[PDB]
Design a protein around this ligand. Sequence first.
Ligand code: NAG
Length: 34
Amino acid sequence: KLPPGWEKRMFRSNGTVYYFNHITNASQFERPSG
Ligand SMILES: *[C@@H]1O[C@H](CO)[C@@H](O)[C@H](O)[C@H]1NC(C)=O
């Protein structure tokens, strides 16, 4: 869906999950894959 560089990421201290683009530095909660 969204580009290569997005990867799954997790908020320590509450356990929430999101995605992070380690190629651009962006963050989004909807998943470019799943
Ligand atoms: C969990 O913490 C992050 C920041 O660490 C925050 O952005 C996120 O909204 C929190 N989870 C929920 C369900 O709000």
